[PDB]
Amino acid sequence: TEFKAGSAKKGATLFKTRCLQCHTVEKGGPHKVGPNLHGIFGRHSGQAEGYSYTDANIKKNVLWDENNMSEYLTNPKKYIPGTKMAYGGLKKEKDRNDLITYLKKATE
Template sequence: MPLPEAKPPDGATLFKQQCATCHTTTLSDAVRQGPSLFKIVGKAAGKADDFRYSAGFAKADFVWDEARLDAYLANPQATIPGSIMAYRQPRAETRAAIIAYLKELN
């Protein structure tokens, strides 16, 4: 009897596995290595009051949308020179799932 086909992880699971070490998704949790990503879609980049951003983010002049998040997750330093985030996600479907989850938080 063949095993059932495995379902890909959903965005929340992927976020917990790949992002939650450095980021929270609430405003009540303590800030970690990165800022909270609660309601990040539509928010100005580098402007959270409770986080000290890198020099690259201090110069950022845009609002986070799906396209910016996708580009940033694929290559943070190319999107925001001076960014110190080491995480890169080369798989478009994984980035899309994480971004869909972040949009749910709005």
């Protein structure tokens, strides 16, 4: 417990504004710059099929739960150096909380 639920409403707009450029969340949604994130929670990193991940992601072999996801979202490259995800990150815990609350929900 180092993650606490935030707004899904608010989570959804941080997603549209900071993640939608490269990712989809819907089941049957396509890979774009980044992979479709449907069902990511509980999945290891680099396993969406038909997506060309970097050696770094695959290797990090991250098991995604709201907690892992929060550290990563703080600073992706610092978390999986070599990842091709080009997003600086979400420095505020409160934002991370709202977005994860949104993802926890829309990736199911």
